[PDB]
Design a protein around this ligand. Structure first.
Ligand code: FAD
Ligand code: FAD
Ligand code: HCI
Ligand code: HCI
Lengths: 684, 684
């Protein structure tokens, strides 16, 4: 039941509704242009040329094509990253980034004849990511082939935690080297306790609407559910799950599940020597390192259960690749498609400028101001009709938080502490304008944004001959070498990914992909930040040797007499010297990889997710929208960036129509009216 | 009621027992040597010359002095930090570090006539930190003066969160600029809910033994508690608190408390425009930025409620300075006193070497092996009778985790991935040897240590003339300038601390002291890692300007209609150009600042805290003890490092006496026997 084309994946998830937006399938909303605009010549800015900004541009292009003769849309896209694809028409990165969709091309002096690609950011795409596949179809066509991402368990995998080793594929004990493994037993207990059963008895510990989450997932993914059922999930049952469990961490939930299983006798004493609490703790930590299909979630144990449950409902781990050499091609293709679809009515200019401030000011028709600096620090100011701020939360903070929270007669905005030139704005209001009357409403949105949690992440890469996998010391599973390794060595998760530039001679050795504390623990060894090498011609050899040295561990295998150094040390050492690499998202200007919500964070991220509903308040006249995975309930996924873009453009349409929701398509209207409004007064 | 000398602080906390060790006052246990050793000539290693290693050394000195003629203790202390005081027997750091007790001396070319000191690590010491003050008396005498640390609220303070500004000193509303402040209301709500009342009705939401924590604190601190109270807390009531609440975060607890208060009407809707969940969220986040007396605990909201409760019981925020110019002097003095107290029976040698591996091996008397590398990267191997591993958990992991979990015929240990020379050990057992028969037991301790949470932290410093605070642009409150600023600007917490080298001409401008995500968000701007400048003669001017720029915010005050750039911008910009600085503990080899326990982490930290009880199993030939704040229930305090050292030495004494607890003094026995053992042995 494996999808083989973009269209197959697209259709698989076309109906899926997420539980915070249960009244709408975003792919259905996105099928036709989102609405209509009054006649006019619009001047719009998009800050950020990542997935969110480019999806927003595409939707604007679709809108532009519907405008009558004499009307049109001009977009200024601001993109500060010198390596963005937008500024481009050994390890090469120049022109190979679209924000956090970021490739590194390994070559020997001719980039048109490379060895492999490192996917430094996004790399694996859930089957049920329906908006992602909708845009992949726009970019590449339904016919384009996709592959199963070689996740732990999708390819032969070695797992190591403490004294436990496993070698496996999937979850059928027939496919495990040790079918009696305690690791597979704890997986079944934790899956049972978190997901439960789609049919029959409810066995999950944390029900939604009094039933196992599996049963709710089937309703969220139906073509014709109850309408009544979707509204009840939206307004009653998911809010009640949040009220109950938003204060419970994933790690706490795992321990609750394991405790009950241990008391029932479903899980036996470990070694039968450990006492009750040591056994339970061992199982919690074993599951922590093993995970849900993408490696250990131990480092993610502080997320809310609500956040994990979103991923459970989505079947997040069932992932595919894109029909590309480099994932940045997706975003580049969407940018080109935006310009094509605008059919002459969309004009786009790219600015290599960093936006420092946004506000509303003045008394002219265009009041949405952006203050920016070019690559030699010269200041620029421009006013727009509407602005989409398509940057993640730590990048948005300085832009929206330094103007105060209410009317100001005059402000000199800009990066004064840097020594840079300021600009005087008059009759100034905050850009994220939720009230004409409330500074507190304006402060709530800003303070929420600034306190969202950006998960930390790093990726260590090297280039290895694929034939290294055929060495006698590389274990096999039914003749196929092990190609994923999940471990407590400090490396966390490692993958030997065939080169997409092609059986390929080379593989990308993702030696370590870490989250959260696992990333923190390595960071002292990276040497140069955010990228080692910082140059095209360097190699991060010293850094990488510290990773090889973390793999230099004596690993005992069952039946063997004595431990020997781990074979994976030998594999890591087979990578060539040149082109060793690390990228640390934490010391990138994103200040991490992507939003993941902690306990209590729902209320902050959900405010952001609903922000575009300000467009219902007609007299407010707020011209700023936000578009990033940080303003979604899928931080860490293109799906989140894309959903937030959709929200932003939908809201822009309602604002352009002075609060009239009838200007949205029938299918798009729920993007705005299916959420709780962010402005209670005035109504609309 | 304010302590004014070391002795006054020492006596104030001499009886306090922490709830995970409630049967014993560590200062009372430490009043005499901890026990006796059989006659002999002991070879002991201490890995690490920080507070834990040096306190362990002092206690070994006290023991050595009791040995008969012909007996003695030889200690090899391994210390890899080239800036340690142990190797020294514009911004200067050389010789001014004792691990995370770390001074930076600001001078103008003569280090004997400096301007100020930056306390880069430890800087403020709770009154009731009884072991800390016990050792401070050994180092300085009871008569030595101390001062109240100028925490937010101890000095005039400005607090900024969103649109809210408060200026205050203390918790008496008469000395708040706005006695009707919502900040003061939420602080009272959260105090009532978490701490409650020492007398009368119980009002707290999370009771211990069915009463308010305030009542338990008083018991724990009593010279003469009621009969059975400490045992019942240790075995029943504190375990029951953990069972109930270790799965609840601090942020979750705050929200529960605020929700009840909001429903009761104690906290009103924020203004007329916010809905219920918005107002609740506002108060949670307002309290988050304000804190408990040491600045906002929002970044610490993921800690377990259990962990916060330990700090509540301890009255942790009521803190003092040491009688020093630089805090490192404390540890230096304790090292010298260790040698003096040994009475010529303790010999100490310092090795400027990094330990890479520990194990048990061979058949000789001294079986505890350490593999190390000197400053030329040459390998060294040495065997000892006993070893104290006095390094925090991320530094300990490579030393204890790479040898497997059971007997090995031979292992070639060392940093082979780095290309460094290995050493062959034969008949090898892991160093942290909990079992002769259970690899899982051995794995539990290793995996626990490797998964403890190291909180992230950074400090940004500059030098400013103290007279800057007398300028008309610096606000005065109750007769003094503002000297503490707690803000959501990104700086988190800022302090203008008078130089200790002296009223002083200069002050240390601690521009930003951040924890956890607050630190993550800054890290991309630090420039050089872990320290900018990396040289004595440089200045982190570019970095600091990014901090000044975070302060370039328009702040509306009640006292002026036209908001202006925050006054604190101007103060930060008043710092001189030379000697601007940041230290990032995360990119230091500690991989962060100090342990703070997440939900669930008790199970791992408490295993480490109790590890020294292995000495009870006489048939188990385990020669290794651990000594750091990582292995305590006071990560982030010298008190934790000192408690762990006391544990380590107590366990060493029992092991050296082949399991005989009577070799501990009457007052020190409970250090071992008051805890649940990590090995099962017969009663009594
Ligand atoms: C380590 C990692 C792993 C991931 N794995 C996956 C995965 O396998 N699958 C998946 O679906 N998703 C994955 N993601 C998530 C995915 O990459 C993001 O959801 C998506 O790329 C984010 O798009 P965005 O538009 O929200 O933000 P960004 O990609 O951050 O784009 C924002 C853009 O704005 C620009 N910008 C920022 N500030 C300014 C400014 N002041 N002025 C001008 N320009 C500015 C930036 O340079 C950037 O180009 C991963 C991300 C990371 C980092
Ligand atoms: C930002 C920050 C703020 C703090 N604030 C306070 C405070 O105000 N009050 C308070 O009481 N405490 C505070 N602390 C906590 C206090 O600093 C620590 O509890 C204490 O210093 C830790 O001592 P330790 O011996 O456990 O470890 P460390 O201080 O880390 O010492 C370990 C030693 O071992 C050495 N070492 C490490 N690995 C090896 C190896 N492989 N071989 C050889 N040598 C090695 C190191 O170089 C170091 O000298 C703070 C700490 C930080 C970082
Ligand atoms: O690596 C991934 O699979 C995508 C990023 C991510 C990681 C963990 C949780 C959510 C998203
Ligand atoms: O800064 C401090 O007060 C000491 C370190 C610390 C910080 C927060 C919680 C525990 C310890």
């Amino acid at each position: 039941k494996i999808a083989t084309t973009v269209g197959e994946a697209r259709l698989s998830g076309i109906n899926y509704r997420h539980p915070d937006s249960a009244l709408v399938s975003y792919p259905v909303a996105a099928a036709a242009p989102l609405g209509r605009l009054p006649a006019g010549n619009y001047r719009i800015a998009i800050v950020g040329g990542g997935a969110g900004g480019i999806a927003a541009l595409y939707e604007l292009g679709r809108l532009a094509a519907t405008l009558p003769a004499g009307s049109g849309i001009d977009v200024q896209i601001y993109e500060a990253d010198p390596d963005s694809f937008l500024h481009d028409r050994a390890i090469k990165v120049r022109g190979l980034k679209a924000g956090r969709v970021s490739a590194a091309l390994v070559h020997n002096g001719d980039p048109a004849s490379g060895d492999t690609i490192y996917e430094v950011g996004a790399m694996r795409f859930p089957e049920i990511a329906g908006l992602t596949w909708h845009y992949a179809s726009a970019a590449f066509g339904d016919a384009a082939p996709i592959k199963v991402f070689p996740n732990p368990g999708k390819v032969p995998t070695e797992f190591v935690f403490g004294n436990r080793v496993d070698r496996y594929v999937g979850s059928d004990p027939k496919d495990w080297e040790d079918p009696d493994s305690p690791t597979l037993k704890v997986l079944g207990v934790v899956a049972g306790g978190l997901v439960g059963n789609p049919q029959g008895e409810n066995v999950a510990m944390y029900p939604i609407a009094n039933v196992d989450p599996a049963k709710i997932a089937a309703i969220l993914n139906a073509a014709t559910p109850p309408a009544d059922a979707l509204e009840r999930i939206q307004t009653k049952y998911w809010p009640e799950f949040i009220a109950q469990y938003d204060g419970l961490t994933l790690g706490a939930a795992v321990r609750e599940i394991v405790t009950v299983a241990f008391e029932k006798g479903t899980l036996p004493p470990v070694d039968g020597v450990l006492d009750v609490d040591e056994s339970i703790s061992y199982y919690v930590e074993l599951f922590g390192r093993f995970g849900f299909g993408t490696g250990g979630f131990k480092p993610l144990y502080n997320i809310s259960l609500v956040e994990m449950m979103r991923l459970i409902l989505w079947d997040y781990s069932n992932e595919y690749t894109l029909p590309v050499t480099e994932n940045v091609e997706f975003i580049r293709n969407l940018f080109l498609k935006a310009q094509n679809v605008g059919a002459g009515k969309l004009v786009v200019q790219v600015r290599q400028e960093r936006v420092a401030n946004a506000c509303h000011s003045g008394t002219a028709s265009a009041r949405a101001q952006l203050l920016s600096y070019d690559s030699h620090n010269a200041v620029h100011s421009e006013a727009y009709d509407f602005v989409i701020l398509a940057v993640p939360h730590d990048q948005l903070t300085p832009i929206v938080s330094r103007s105060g929270f209410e009317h100001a007669a005059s402000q000199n905005l800009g990066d004064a502490g840097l020594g840079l030139e300021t600009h005087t704005y008059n009759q100034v209001y905050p850009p994220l304008l939720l009230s004409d009357s409330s500074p507190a409403a304006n402060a709530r949105i800003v303070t929420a944004i600034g306190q969202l949690h950006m998960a930390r992440s790093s990726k260590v890469f090297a280039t290895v001959k694929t034939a290294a996998l055929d060495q006698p010391w590389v274990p096999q599973w039914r003749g196929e070498p092990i190609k994923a390794v999940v471990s407590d060595s400090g490396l966390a998760a490692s993958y030997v990914v065939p080169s997409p530039i092609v059986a390929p001679e080379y593989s990308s050795l993702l030696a370590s992909y870490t989250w959260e504390d696992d990333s923190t623990r390595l960071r002292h060894d990276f040497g140069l930040y955010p990228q080692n090498p910082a140059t095209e011609t360097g190699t991060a050899d010293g850094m990488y040797r510290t990773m090889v040295n973390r793999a230099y561990r004596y690993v005992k295998y069952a039946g063997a007499s004595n431990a020997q150094p781990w074979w994976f040390y030998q594999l890591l050492a087979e990578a060539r010297t040149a082109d060793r690499f690390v990228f640390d998202w934490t010391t990138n200007k994103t200040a991490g990889g992507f939003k993941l919500d902690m306990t209590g964070d729902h209320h902050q991220s959900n405010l952001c997710f609903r922000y575009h509903t300000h467009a219902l308040a007609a007299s407010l006249d707020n011209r700023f929208f936000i578009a990033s995975d940080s303003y979604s309930h899928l931080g860490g996924w293109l799906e989140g960036a894309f959903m937030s873009a959709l929200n932003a453009v939908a809201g822009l349409i309602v604002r352009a129509n002075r609060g009239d929701v009838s200007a949205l398509s029938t299918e798009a209207r729920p993007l705005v009216i299916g959420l709780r409004p962010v402005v209670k007064v005035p109504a609309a």
